Amino acid sequence: MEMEKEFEQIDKSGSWAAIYQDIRHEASDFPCRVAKLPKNKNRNRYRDVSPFDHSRIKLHQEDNDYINASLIKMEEAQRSYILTQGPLPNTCGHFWEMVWEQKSRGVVMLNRVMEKGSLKCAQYWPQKEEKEMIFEDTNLKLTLISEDIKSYYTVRQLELENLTTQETREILHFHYTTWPDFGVPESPASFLNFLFKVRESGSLSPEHGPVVVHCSAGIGRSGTFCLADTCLLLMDKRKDPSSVDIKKVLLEMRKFRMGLIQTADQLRFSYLAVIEGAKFIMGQWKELSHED
Numbered sequence: 001m002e003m004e005k006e007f008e009q010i011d012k013s014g015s016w017a018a019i020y021q022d023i024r025h026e027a028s029d030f031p032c033r034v035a036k037l038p039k040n041k042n043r044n045r046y047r048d049v050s051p052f053d054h055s056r057i058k059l060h061q062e063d064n065d066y067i068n069a070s071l072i073k074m075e076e077a078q079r080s081y082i083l084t085q086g087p088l089p090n091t092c093g094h095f096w097e098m099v100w101e102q103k104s105r106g107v108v109m110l111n112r113v114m115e116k117g118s119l120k121c122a123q124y125w126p127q128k129e130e131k132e133m134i135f136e137d138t139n140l141k142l143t144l145i146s147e148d149i150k151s152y153y154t155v156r157q158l159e160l161e162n163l164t165t166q167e168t169r170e171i172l173h174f175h176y177t178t179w180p181d182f183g184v185p186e187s188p189a190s191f192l193n194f195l196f197k198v199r200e201s202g203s204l205s206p207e208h209g210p211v212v213v214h215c216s217a218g219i220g221r222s223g224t225f226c227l228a229d230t231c232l233l234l235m236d237k238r239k240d241p242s243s244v245d246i247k248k249v250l251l252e253m254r255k256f257r258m259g260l261i262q263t264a265d266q267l268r269f270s271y272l273a274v275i276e277g278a279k280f281i282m283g284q285w286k287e288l289s290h291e292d
């Protein structure tokens, strides 16, 4: 399998770090002037992680439309994602205003609220049906409707209400809960399963706004999700699946948001996910059926 073979060549030569550095060097650099405005200081989790001005998402509110989020538009694959940082105590209302204004169906969360004894993002969703959340600054209501805790992830149904208009929508929260505190997963099996669970839900589909993907910084684990998904999608769209080059797909995603894939291990893991994902697609995690 084309890339598989390259994969193995990089392993033999032990050059993941060198491959990864080439990407860091070749990546786009665009300005992030709005992100750096003194007034957005508390809207950014990390100083070194900002959205480029050209692909940033804008809040449809007057005066301060800023949120640390980017639209990654994959023209060939026909997929769009909004990669964002994990909400802060002060940006949960902005986070949901965005979900609302962008017409997203799903939110993909790839971290735990606490990891390594530290807080990785705010608790931005209700944990109990009877205890709903209200975000006064953006005038929105959010209710946990149902929760389905599984082995490697938890899916939640939430109801988001725009208090101004009393309009409501169902939002699906797909929460991968098993990313290990250090390094990356040993096998992609579970991440691939989770990705395909997200697809199944319609959250990545054209009839809805872009999916909202986040981790803590919104470039590491988050990059892996979008990169893996796009690559797989391209492999069954093209006449020559082997022609799909991950490094080049990654460089294209980085035109829209900086840092996607933060370590050589994340890179190696992404290859793995695509390779094993393609191999699954070409023959238990799913029904032997072919009803469709």
Ligand SMILES: CCc1oc2cc(S(=O)(=O)N(C)C)ccc2c1C(=O)c1cc(Br)c(O)c(Br)c1
Pocket (backbone or CB within 6 Å): 187, 188, 189, 190, 192, 193, 194, 196, 197, 200, 276, 277, 278, 279, 280, 281, 285, 286
């Ligand atoms: C293509 C998606 C996928 O790829 C996998 C690869 C493995 S593996 O790496 O463990 N393997 C070598 C079979 C396991 C499970 C999966 C896996 C799935 O779990 C999965 C889930 C759903 Br829902 C699907 O519709 C499909 Br197709 C596949």
